Amino acid sequence: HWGYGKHNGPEHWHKDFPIAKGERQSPVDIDTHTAKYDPSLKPLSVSYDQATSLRILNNGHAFNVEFDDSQDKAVLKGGPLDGTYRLIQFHFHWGSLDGQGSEHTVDKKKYAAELHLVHWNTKYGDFGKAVQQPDGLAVLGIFLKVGSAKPGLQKVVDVLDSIKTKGKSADFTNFDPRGLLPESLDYWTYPGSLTTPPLLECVTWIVLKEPISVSSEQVLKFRKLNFNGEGEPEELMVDNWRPAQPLKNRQIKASFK
Ligand SMILES: [Zn+2]
Structure with a gap:
């Protein structure tokens, strides 16, 4: 019964999930004055031309756009990574107000939302085995600010009414996740955890x-989603973000000077 409410939010999660107080928890604050450029990094390779989206699901915590991950269709490689990581799903975290919603912060700045493109390492055969490994997943995180519309997000926004409540899903084929990326692939990287x-x-x-x-308008439609199931008291799906966790014995590396 974890969530983001008044009595089951991030500060309670440790009771059922003691690794919430672990050594490599996420998100973190990214201090741009201490992250160091790493010349050993590569450019990222984002290979999404063959991506096959399937479905969108409200899971009661966020919504996931799910992909066919049974072949190397949409993969992330390069950067800090060894091997090939397949896209399984993306989802977002967002706020009730434009000044909060992101999980990572940058010099303590909170963005309005954060996109997570989740990928698993093909050497481990399936997602469920991958999450048991220190290098099982690669998550591409992208901050959202409120300003101009993002055209490539609109197809997501316009299906949200169909998945208002927990447990609802809808067909979601032929979505191109490249329409969610910024121009630059410059990045920070560090080792961490799932944020739920x-x-x-x-x-x-x-x-x-x-x-x-x-x-x-786009963000406002995200804020109409519900945490609850159909026929239950309405609880808006907002503020579904975990705050920054202690960095501990980790370094954040930058791909750019
Ligand atoms: Zn996430």
């Missing part, structure tokens, strides 16, 4: 420096 229970420490984070802009 079970909070497993299996993630290579790759957080893009350049945010994307979404419109106030």
